Amino acid sequence: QLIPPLINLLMSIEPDVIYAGHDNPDTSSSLLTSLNQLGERQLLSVVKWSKSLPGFRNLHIDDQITLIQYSWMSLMVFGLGWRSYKHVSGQMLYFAPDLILNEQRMKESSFYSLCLTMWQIPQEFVKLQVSQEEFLCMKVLLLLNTIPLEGLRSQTQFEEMRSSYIRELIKAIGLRQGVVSSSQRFYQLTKLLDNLHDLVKQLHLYCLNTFIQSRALSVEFPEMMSEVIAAQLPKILAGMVKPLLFH
Numbered sequence: 001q002l003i004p005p006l007i008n009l010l011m012s013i014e015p016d017v018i019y020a021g022h023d024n025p026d027t028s029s030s031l032l033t034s035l036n037q038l039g040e041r042q043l044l045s046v047v048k049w050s051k052s053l054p055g056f057r058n059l060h061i062d063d064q065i066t067l068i069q070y071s072w073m074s075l076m077v078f079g080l081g082w083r084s085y086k087h088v089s090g091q092m093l094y095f096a097p098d099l100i101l102n103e104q105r106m107k108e109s110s111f112y113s114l115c116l117t118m119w120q121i122p123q124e125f126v127k128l129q130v131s132q133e134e135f136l137c138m139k140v141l142l143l144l145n146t147i148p149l150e151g152l153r154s155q156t157q158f159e160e161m162r163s164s165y166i167r168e169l170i171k172a173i174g175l176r177q178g179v180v181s182s183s184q185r186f187y188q189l190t191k192l193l194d195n196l197h198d199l200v201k202q203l204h205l206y207c208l209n210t211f212i213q214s215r216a217l218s219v220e221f222p223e224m225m226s227e228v229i230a231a232q233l234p235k236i237l238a239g240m241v242k243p244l245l246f247h
């Protein structure tokens with residue numbers, strides 16, 4: 001309608017809701033395994049999605065692969081925030097329609113602590129009242145929010161691609177926002193993205209530790225998920241990548 005074309009395209013390429021396949025007898029092991037399964041399924045959707053994402057397929061194949069493997073985590077927790085904020089007013093973590101967790105289902109300490117950290121996103125969503133339009137644009141920026149220390153092969157086309165999406169976000173902010181109020185809401189939304197780097201870092205550490213101890217904890221990791229983890233997680237944890245900040 002009165003909504004910009006690219007934002008409309010972004011909405012059309014958003015995947016259908018993904019189920020985890022959970023049963024429900026939730027042990028910590030059966031819960032983590034279900035979360036890795038849902039992740040495996042989300043990874044597939046991310047990749048298929050990036051192929052319709054305007055501008056993405058025009059970057060080097062190496063670059064497409066690097067950006068995906070660098071951002072899967074941030075993307076999955078950011079979309080967790082949306083679903084949570086949208087279906088249960090952000091007061092419950094809506095991983096999937098068959099895997100929604102309240103405070104009672106988070107028995108183990110470390111696990112409840114991880115959840116409390118992810119919960120910050122849907123809480124900001126409820127607070128700033130993030131829009132469907134703003135969300136879609138921000139999700140794309142996250143895909144383009146970290147690059148190799150030495151840069152990307154198609155760096156120029158990447159920088160041009162990222163600017164279009166920053167301009168697109170401003171368009172979505174202009175849908176509801178004034179000059180100072182719009183300029184202020186821009187500061188707010190790009191600061192939120194900035195704060196995700198630090199947020200995703202804790203999820204990474206918890207993930208790699210759970211992966212490395214997958215035998216003991218009896219927690220299974222699928223093939224595609226095991227690959228991105230093994231291929232990029234350690235490097236990222238060691239801070240051997242370049243985070244793109246707005247502030």
Ligand SMILES: C#C[C@]1(O)CC[C@H]2[C@@H]3CCC4=CC(=O)CC[C@@H]4[C@H]3CC[C@@]21CC
Pocket residue numbers: 032035036038039042073076077079080095096203204206207208210
């Ligand atoms: C529990 C656990 C973890 O190990 C640490 C952070 C976690 C992820 C955080 C975000 C996420 C949102 C979803 O909607 C699908 C499952 C995924 C998660 C699966 C399990 C992880 C990554 C493998």
